[PDB]
Structure 1
Amino acid sequence: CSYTVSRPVYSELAFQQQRERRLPERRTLRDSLARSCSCSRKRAFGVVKTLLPILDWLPKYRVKEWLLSDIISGVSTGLVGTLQGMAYALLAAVPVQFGLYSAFFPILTYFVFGTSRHISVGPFPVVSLMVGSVVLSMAPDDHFLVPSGNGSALNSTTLDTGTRDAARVLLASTLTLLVGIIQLVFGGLQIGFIVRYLADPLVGGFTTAAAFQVLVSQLKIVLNVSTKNYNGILSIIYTLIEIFQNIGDTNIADFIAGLLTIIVCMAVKELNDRFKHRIPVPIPIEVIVTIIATAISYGANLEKNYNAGIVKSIPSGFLPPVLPSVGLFSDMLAASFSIAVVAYAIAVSVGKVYATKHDYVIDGNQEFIAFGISNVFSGFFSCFVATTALSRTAVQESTGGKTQVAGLISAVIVMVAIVALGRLLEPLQKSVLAAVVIANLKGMFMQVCDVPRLWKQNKTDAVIWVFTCIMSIILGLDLGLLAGLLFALLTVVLRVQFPSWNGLGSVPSTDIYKSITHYKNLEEPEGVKILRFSSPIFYGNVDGFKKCINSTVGFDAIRVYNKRLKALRRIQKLIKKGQPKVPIHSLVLDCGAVSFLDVVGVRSLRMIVKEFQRIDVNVYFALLQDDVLEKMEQCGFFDDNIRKDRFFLTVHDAILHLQNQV
Structure 2
Amino acid sequence: QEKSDTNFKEFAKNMILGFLPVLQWLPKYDLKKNILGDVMSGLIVGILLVPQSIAYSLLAGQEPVYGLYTSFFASIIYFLLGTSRHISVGIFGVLCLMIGETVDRELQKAGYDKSCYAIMVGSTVTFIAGVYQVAMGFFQVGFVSVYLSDALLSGFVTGASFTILTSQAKYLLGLNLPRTNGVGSLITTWIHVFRNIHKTNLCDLITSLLCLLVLLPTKELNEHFKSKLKAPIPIELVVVVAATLASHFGKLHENYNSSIAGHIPTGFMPPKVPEWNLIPSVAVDAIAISIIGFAITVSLSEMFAKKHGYTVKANQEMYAIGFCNIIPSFFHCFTTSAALAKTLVKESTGCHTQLSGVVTALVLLLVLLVIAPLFYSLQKSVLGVITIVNLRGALRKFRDLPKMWSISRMDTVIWFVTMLSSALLSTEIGLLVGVCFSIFCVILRTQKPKSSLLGLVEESEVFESVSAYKNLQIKPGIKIFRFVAPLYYINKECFKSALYKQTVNPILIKVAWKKALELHTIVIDCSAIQFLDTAGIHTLKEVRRDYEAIGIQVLLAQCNPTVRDSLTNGEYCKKEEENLLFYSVYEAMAFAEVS
Judge same fold: TM > 0.5, yes or no: yes
Residues 494-543 of structure 1 show CA distances to partners (whole Å, capped at 9, x for unaligned) of 11233222221112222121111111111111211111111111111111
Shift of 1:558: 2.3
The code of the aligned residue for 2:54 comes to T
Residues 445 and 293 from structure 1, CA distance in 2 versus in 1: closer, same or farther, beyond 3 angstroms?
Answer: same
Contact 2:478–2:521 (CA<8 Å) still a contact in 1? yes
**One-letter amino acid matched to 1:204:** S
The range that moved more, 347-356 or 503-512, is: 347-356
SS in 1 for 2:401: helix
TM-score between both structures, scaled by the size of structure 1: 0.79
1:8, distance to aligned residue in structure 2 (A): 3.5
What SS class does the counterpart of residue 594 from structure 1 fall into?
coil
5+ residue gaps, structure 2, are: none
Say if 2:556 is the partner of 1:588: no
1:21 aligns with 2:9: yes
Instruction: Describe the SS at the equivalent of 2:254.
Output: coil
Distance 1:241 1:53 in 2: 52
For 1:614, the aligned partner's letter is A
Does structure 1 retain, via aligned residues, the 8 Å contact 2:59–2:96? Answer: no
Q: Which residue number corresponds to residue 426 of structure 2?
A: 476
Partner of 1:9: 3
Residue 324 of structure 2 aligns to a residue whose secondary structure is helix
Equivalent of 2:286, from 340, 347, 356?
Answer: 340
Cα deviation, 1:567-620, whole Å, max 9, x if unaligned, reads 3xxxxxxxxxxxxx5x11111111111222211211221122211112221111
Distance in 2 (CA, whole Å) between partners of 1:222 and 1:56 is 49
Q: Which amino acid aligns with 1:340?
A: A
- 1:306 corresponds to: 256
Asked whether the equivalents of residues 46 and 364 of structure 2 are also in contact (C-alpha less than 8 Å), the reply is: no
Identity %: 29
Partner of 2:449: helix, strand, or coil?
Answer: coil
Report the 3-state secondary structure (helix = DSSP H, G, I; strand = E; otherwise coil) of the residue aligned with 1:515: coil
The question of 1:120 aligning with 2:90 is answered: yes
C-alpha separation in 2, matches of 1:431 and 1:616: 84
Which residue does 1:539 correspond to in 2? Answer: 489
**Matching of residues 503-582 of structure 1 within 5 Å:** 503-553=453-503, 555-567=504-516
Partner residue in 2 for 1:158? none
Give, in whole Å, the separation in 2 of the partners of 1:621 and 1:640.
12
Could you say which residue in structure 2 is the equivalent of 1:609?
544
Q: What secondary structure sits across from 1:535 in the alignment?
A: coil
Residues in 2 aligned to 1:168 and 1:207: alpha-carbon distance in whole angstroms: 25
SS of the residue corresponding to residue 481 of structure 2 reads strand
Deviation readout 1:383-417 (Å, 9 max, x if unpaired): 33x1449xxx4552565556676654444344322
Contact 2:236 2:386 in 1 (8 A): yes
Q: CA deviation at 1:135?
A: 5.2
> What is the alpha-carbon distance in structure 2 between the residues aligned to residue 174 and residue 483 of structure 1?
27
- Distance verdict in 2 for CA 1:309–1:278, change over 3 Å: same
CA distance in 1, matches of 2:347, 2:196: 38
In structure 1, which of residues 376, 380, 388 is the aligned counterpart of residue 326 of structure 2?
Answer: 376
- Contact 1:119/1:350 (<8 A) preserved: no
| Aligned equivalents of 2:383, 2:346: Cα separation in 1 | 17
Q: Does 1:272 align with 2:204?
A: no
For the residue of structure 1 that corresponds to 2:464, the secondary structure is strand
Partner of 2:447: 497
Shift of 1:84: 2.3
How far apart in 2 are the matches of 1:204 and 1:478? 15
Which residue does the alignment assign to 2:48?
76
Q: Is the 8 A contact 1:89 1:97 kept in 2?
A: no
Match of 1:575 in 2: none
Tell which deviates more after alignment, 529-538 or 341-350: 341-350
Aligned: 1:131 with 2:103: yes
1:40-80, Cα deviation, whole Å (9 max, x unpaired): x6xx72x6555456678986995565433442222222321
Whether the 8 Å contact between 2:261 and 2:380 is mirrored in structure 1 is yes
> Higher mean Cα deviation, 624-633 or 48-57?
48-57
* Counterparts of 1:356 and 1:213, CA distance in 2: 29
Tell me how far apart the structure 2 counterparts of residues 342 and 359 of structure 1 sit (CA, whole Å). 26
Query: Structure 1 stretch 239-248 or stretch 52-61: which is displaced more?
Result: 52-61
Residue identity matched to 1:124: C
Residue 487 of structure 1 is matched in structure 2 by 437
C-alpha contact (below 8 Å) 2:243/2:378 kept by paired residues: yes
Q: Report the equivalent of 1:191.
A: 141
Query: What is the CA–CA distance in structure 2 between the aligned matches of 1:349 and 1:242, rounded to whole Å?
Result: 35
Conservation of the 8 A alpha-carbon contact between 2:174 and 2:381 = no
**Alpha-carbon separation, structure 1, partners of 2:314 and 2:175:** 39
**Aligned match of 2:68 in 89, 100, 104?**
100
For residues 271-305 of structure 1, the C-alpha deviation after alignment (integer angstroms, 9 at most, x for no partner) is 23343111222211111112111222221122222
| Offset at residue 235 of structure 1 (A) | 1.5
Whether the aligned pair in 2 keeps the contact of 1:182 and 1:337 (CA below 8 Å) is no
Q: Distance in 2 between matches of 1:355 and 1:497?
A: 36
Distance 1:338 1:463 in 2: 28
Q: CA deviation at 1:371?
A: 2.7
Cα distance change on mapping 1:503 and 1:356 into 2, 3 Å: farther
Amino acid at match of 2:9: R
C-alpha contact (below 8 Å) 1:77/1:395 kept by paired residues:
no
Alpha-carbon distance in structure 1 between the residues aligned to 2:452 and 2:25: 51
Q: Secondary structure at the match of 1:318?
A: coil
What is the letter of the counterpart of residue 166 of structure 2? Answer: V
CA separation in 1, counterparts of 2:322 and 2:108?
Answer: 24
Which residue in the other structure is 2:193 paired with? 243
Seen in structure 2, the aligned counterparts of structure 1 residues 550 and 63 have a Cα distance that, compared at 3 Å, is farther
Alpha-carbon separation, structure 1, partners of 2:20 and 2:443: 38
Does structure 1 retain, via aligned residues, the 8 Å contact 2:186–2:423?
yes
Q: Look up the equivalent residue of 2:285 and give its one-letter code.
A: I
Decide whether aligned partners of structure 1 residues 407 and 230 sit closer, same or farther in structure 2, where only a CA change above 3 A counts.
farther
| C-alpha contact (below 8 Å) 1:505/1:514 kept by paired residues | yes
The structure richer in helix per residue is 1
Paired residues of 2:103 and 2:122 also in contact (CA < 8 A): yes
1:85-127 deviations in Å (ceiling 9; x for gaps): 244243xxxx775343333323432443344726424761222
In structure 2, the partner of 1:26 is none
> Which deviates more, 181-190 or 209-218?
181-190
Distance (whole Å) between structure 1 residues aligned to residue 305 and residue 197 of structure 2 = 44
> What is the letter of the counterpart of residue 425 of structure 1?
F
Instruction: Find 2:534's aligned residue among 599, 606, 609.
Output: 599
User: In the alignment, what sits opposite 1:622?
Assistant: 557
Task: Name the aligned partner's letter for residue 308 of structure 1.
Answer: S
Spell out, residue by residue over 1:107-162, the C-alpha distance to the aligned partner (whole angstroms, 9 max, x if none).
Answer: 4324433447264247612223213423554x443xxxxxxxxxxxxxxxxxxx5x
Give the whole-Å Cα distance in 1 for the aligned partners of 2:403 and 2:36. 36
Matched residue, 2:405: 455
- The structure with the larger Rg is 1
Residues 99, 122 of structure 2: 8 Å contact kept: no
Structure 1 pair 130–64 and aligned structure 2 pair: CA distance change class (3 A): same
- The DSSP-based 3-state class of the residue aligned with 1:200 is coil
* TM alignment of 1:290-369, pairs within 5 A: 290-324=240-274, 326=276, 328=277, 332-333=279-280, 335-348=281-294, 350-351=296-297, 366-369=316-319
Check conservation: 2:90, 2:337, Cα contact below 8 A. yes
Q: Number of matched residues?
A: 579
Structure 1 residues 50 and 263, CA, compared in 2 at 3 Å: closer, same or farther? farther
In the other structure, the counterpart of 2:77 is 109
What secondary structure is seen at the aligned counterpart in 2 of 1:620?
A: strand
Q: Which amino acid aligns with 1:509?
A: E
- Helix, strand or coil for the counterpart of 1:336? coil
2:302 and 2:134 mapped to 1: Cα distance?
28
Cα RMSD for the two superposed structures: 3.2
